[model samples]
Target: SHMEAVQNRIVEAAERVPGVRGVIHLRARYVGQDIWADMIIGVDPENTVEQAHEICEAVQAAVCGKIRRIESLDVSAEARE
Candidate 1:
């Protein structure tokens, strides 16, 4: 289950991203041999929408850079407050 390992790595990396309170949810599944994902990162009430978006962008880049084989990635935000 390499994809499972990938999933764990993404979750760990995403949680460490600045402005991210934690990873609320994540799914890494294969579609026609290509890995794709949906992720949700939680943020505190102190952060603005812009800041949350930046967190997602950093998470996307970090996860993609680590695995480098995903087809599509969808990342959303959740309010922790």
Candidate 2:
């Protein structure tokens, strides 16, 4: 229930961003308790780091009501290029 609320908020925020392509919600449970949850926001190929960061921060704040913690990992789109 809590996770669902968080995921919904994430989806809503992601949809508002200009270049967001899709949003995927992932969750894990250990012994019937939620352990990890993530909202993977997919953006258009032209999306800039600044834009993505803004969207991420907004979603993080909104989801804080349902999640106890949040950690972010930012990777270059061309890291392997």
Candidate 3:
């Protein structure tokens, strides 16, 4: 339940950003002493490559800013169907 709470927080952080449609997947693992997070955020299907990249970067910034324990956060983009 605690892990799910953390995951929800991570998802919420990304969802707060304007262009993010949803969070597709999230993986948080203990790598040594730090936590590594890999997440995929969905965006508009019509968004350009550059726009999608910007949205990914924004999501990474937003989540990492709120959750400090995450050693590294990788945000990827996906097109909404």
Candidate 4:
């Protein structure tokens, strides 16, 4: 149930970001001493590099910032048409 909550919260919060169309999939877990996160945030095909980058930040912040103080947070993206 906890993992489900993490999955839901991360995706839900990530989808709320202004530049994000939605979060298709998101997962978080404690890896070693850090919180490991992996997710796909929807993207506009026409978005600028900076806009995409910001969305990543928002998504990363949405979970990690709210919960774990992560040492390593890498948010990856896939542009969606």
lDDT of 2 by residue, 46-75 (tens): 657787676666655555544444343221
Best model per TM-score: 3
TM-score between model 1 and native: 0.86
| Best lDDT among the predictions, by candidate number | 3
lDDT digits (tens) for residues 1-81 of candidate 4: 866766676676777778787776666677775657778777997998888898898877776766563455667777876
Clashes of each: 0, 0, 0, 0
lDDT of 1 by residue, 1-81 (tens): 677787888888787778888888998888877789999988987888998888889988877877777778889998996
Task: Write down the lDDT that model 3 would get.
Answer: 0.90
Clash pairs, model 1 backbone: none
Each candidate structure's TM-score, on Cα atoms with residue i matched to residue i, is 0.86, 0.46, 0.92, 0.76
lDDT at 16, model 4: 73
Tell me the lDDT of model 2 at 67. Answer: 46
**Local lDDT at 33 for model 2:** 49
What lDDT does candidate 1 reach at residue 79? 95
* CA deviation > 4 Å runs, candidate 3: none
lDDT of 3 by residue, 23-43 (tens): 999999877756799999999
Write down the lDDT that model 1 would get.
Answer: 0.84
